[PDB]
């Protein structure tokens, strides 16, 4: 049952790639600001909303997996 719920949580993932993100300092104001901005733009997104990114530096992709047969297995 726990694995089934975990698979349900793990249905869809989003990947955001920014060249040079390694230059970010660990646990300083810059990294905290980046994480705040990422979460903030994440919560306001949806079907009725759009997000903007930069072509040269960052890419935003979505990965998904199927779920089926779990009720029969249980």
């Amino acid at each position: 049952e726990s694995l089934a719920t975990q698979i349900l949580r793990r249905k869809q993932q989003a990947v955001w790639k920014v060249k040079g993100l390694a230059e970010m300092c660990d646990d300083d104001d810059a990294q905290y600001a980046a994480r705040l901005r990422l979460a903030q733009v994440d919560d306001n997104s949806g079907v009725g909303r759009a997000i903007g990114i930069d072509a040269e530096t960052e890419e935003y992709d979505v990965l998904n997996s199927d779920i089926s047969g779990v009720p029969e297995f249980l």
Partner: protein, 133 residues
């Protein structure tokens, strides 16, 4: 006008970074820095603002030989001399230094590359935005 002593610090900083600019008259440097201050942000660095503005001004000056002499430079900026030789005295040829690949104009000069790395270190290279209400 951006702060006077900070501007003085920036110009002297770029001068002692590149000693070959000492012979150049100062007011041209003042014009270049006062023009380059339009690009950098302020609160992003807010500590190494002088270093960042000096770097970007130097990159702007040495982008594609935009900064020339006073009058000795002939009115030819769209033309570059690749080689020249006197009859029986000497000869010389020339070539490009960087050979850029992406056309960002930022990874085209060493000063631009250093400024780019400093920006990535200080703030970031990302622009995530969403519609506000």
């Amino acid at each position: 006008i951006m702060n006077q002593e900070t501007l003085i610090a920036a110009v002297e900083q770029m001068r002692k970074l590149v000693p070959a600019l000492r012979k150049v008259p100062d007011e041209t440097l003042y014009a270049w820095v006062e023009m380059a201050e339009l690009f950098v942000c302020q609160k992003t660095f807010k500590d190494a603002y002088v270093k960042a503005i000096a770097l970007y001004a130097l990159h702007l000056a040495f982008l594609d030989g935009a900064l020339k002499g006073e009058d000795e430079d002939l009115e030819s900026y769209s033309r570059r001399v690749t080689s020249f030789s006197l009859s029986g005295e000497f000869s010389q040829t020339f070539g490009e230094v960087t050979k850029n690949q992406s056309g960002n104009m930022m990874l085209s000069t060493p000063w631009g590359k250093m400024f780019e790395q400093l920006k990535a270190r200080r703030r970031g290279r990302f622009a995530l935005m969403t519609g506000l209400r």
